[PDB]
Design a protein around this ligand. Structure first.
Ligand code: HEM
Ligand SMILES: Clc1ccc(-c2cnc[nH]2)cc1
Length: 465
């Protein structure tokens, strides 16, 4: 057959006038009700194919894995990155970067303490800071941003920043601000009309400016690593990349020099800090709205781990309720609802249609996470979505918050380690309270574009002992 069906576009405006005024995702879900699971939407001058539903997404990403392996652009950050970094790269640059990441992290920890060990160390510092708050009300956003940023800082730069460090907090604010700009109304409009909006002042310039500033801190630190590189004591990931680059420096293959160390490092921070902290933020808000849930998670911690020894990843298999709660936080929060855009690399048959080479594809991960067949009453938060009658963890093919296939989240393991360890380490040591009654807690994101951002809230952590 040929092109997927969809709304009739105007020449310059595409389908703007058929859009839902509240955003891209709401817009696409409305087209899905009319056109089904595979459809075309013109974003400005650009046709993009949407795949929705568990079956259609798996079919593309696993069954047609290589054709769907291309990375599409995200208009708001592409001017900065320009296809550097594992996230944004394509073809050989991408394959080679991603394989090196994978092999590097398999070797990580034989030489130096493991990623789990670094996450436990950070969780330790967190709970001492929460203790130090002495039950004061706080917006936990900055702390949650700090802990996830510190895990990447520890892997990449071999150091941690203190929670009160002003230069650290300044940098974190620049990221946070960058992510809310990307997902703002303007950021979604840039997604459609970057071709002419780029000529004007606006949030896209502020984003470029923020990224330039961040990449300057990174570059300076990378330069200090080169200047002080000691081959017999490599300190961190940056030292590992440097030493490799020096050894492979002579020959231009799997060439480092079609790479950019600074941009790759920045993209690690970009992917690594925000979704995890936003997941944490959403998860504690959810625990405030459904307090019996946090209470049941504590009972399992008390039973399997106790009050004295630190949570460990080995504990996960013995804590089905807590795993179900974290899966439900991710499923409900739906933090990258349209995932990250793909492109089909060659003309591709798909469910009777033919998708042209180089067409952008959005896989609407949200529609898998909310599929009613898999999740009875999918718009409500309920950990029983991931539990069988016997209370064991019930895994499902619908649960794809990290996506699938060739491009599946590179930090899936790390992200899962952080969520489990931060969640359980905080809850081992503290109960939580807020001044706002559950009925007055609204869980509606304050922004929903590329990323979902939870509303602001206050919380206090009360020591158990
Ligand atoms: C709970 C937190 C996280 C969620 C929900 C998440 C989800 C995702 C999703 C949906 C994608 C797009 C996959 C695709 O293109 O189909 C992605 C990509 C990616 N993620 Fe994450 N992610 C999380 C945390 C992390 C962390 C902590 C890191 C860094 C260690 C990371 C690194 C990356 C990278 C490098 C990519 C690009 C992969 C590629 O293009 O080959 N992510 N993630
Ligand atoms: Cl624009 C954009 C792209 C990728 C991510 C991401 C990947 N993994 C975690 N976050 C976030 C935002």
């Amino acid at each position: 057959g040929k092109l997927p069906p969809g709304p009739r576009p105007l020449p310059l405006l595409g389908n703007l006038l058929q859009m839902d005024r509240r955003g891209l995702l709401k817009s696409f879900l409305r087209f899905r009700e009319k056109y089904g699971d595979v459809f075309t939407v013109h974003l400005g001058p650009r046709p993009v194919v949407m795949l929705c539903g568990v079956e259609a997404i798996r079919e593309a990403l696993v069954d047609k894995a290589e054709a769907f392996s291309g990375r599409g652009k995200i208009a708001m950050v592409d001017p900065f990155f320009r296809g550097y970094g594992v996230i944004f790269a394509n073809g050989n640059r991408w394959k080679v970067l991603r394989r090196f990441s994978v092999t590097t992290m398999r070797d990580f920890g034989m030489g130096k303490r493991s990623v789990e060990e670094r996450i436990q160390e950070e969780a330790q510092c967190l709970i001492e800071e929460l203790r130090k708050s002495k039950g004061a009300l706080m917006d936990p956003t900055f702390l949650f941003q700090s802990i996830t940023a510190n895990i990447i800082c520890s892997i990449v730069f071999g150091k941690r920043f203190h929670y009160q460090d002003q230069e650290f907090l300044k940098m974190l604010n620049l990221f946070y601000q960058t992510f809310s700009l990307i997902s703002s109304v303007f950021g979604q409009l840039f997604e459609l009309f970057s071709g002419f909006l780029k000529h004007f002042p606006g949030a896209h310039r502020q984003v470029y400016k923020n990224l330039q500033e961040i990449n300057a801190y990174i570059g300076h630190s990378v330069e200090k690593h080169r200047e002080t590189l000691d081959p017999s004591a490599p300190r961190d990931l940056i030292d590992t990349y440097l030493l490799h680059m020096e050894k492979e420096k002579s020959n231009a293959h799997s060439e480092f020099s079609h790479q950019n160390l600074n941009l790759n490092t920045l993209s690690l921070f970009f992917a690594g800090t925000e979704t995890t902290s936003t997941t944490l933020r959403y998860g504690f808000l959810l625990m405030l709205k459904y307090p019996h849930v946090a209470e049941r998670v504590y009972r399992e911690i008390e039973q399997v781990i106790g009050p004295h020894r630190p949570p460990e990843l080995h504990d996960r298999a013995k804590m089905p309720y807590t795993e179900a709660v974290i899966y439900e936080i991710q499923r409900f929060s739906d933090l990258l609802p349209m995932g990250v855009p793909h492109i089909v690399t060659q003309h591709t048959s798909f469910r009777g249609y033919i998708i042209p080479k180089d067409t952008e594809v959005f896989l609407i991960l949200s529609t898998a996470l909310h599929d009613p067949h898999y999740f009875e009453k999918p718009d409500a938060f309920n950990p029983d979505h991931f539990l069988d009658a016997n209370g064991a963890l019930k895994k499902t093919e619908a649960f794809i918050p990290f996506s699938l296939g060739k491009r599946i989240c590179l930090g899936e393991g790390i992200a899962r380690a952080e969520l489990f360890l931060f969640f359980t380490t905080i809850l081992q040591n503290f109960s939580m309270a807020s001044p706002v009654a559950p009925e007055d807690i609204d869980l509606t994101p304050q922004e929903c574009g590329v990323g979902k951002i939870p509303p602001t809230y206050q919380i206090r952590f009360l020591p158990r002992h």
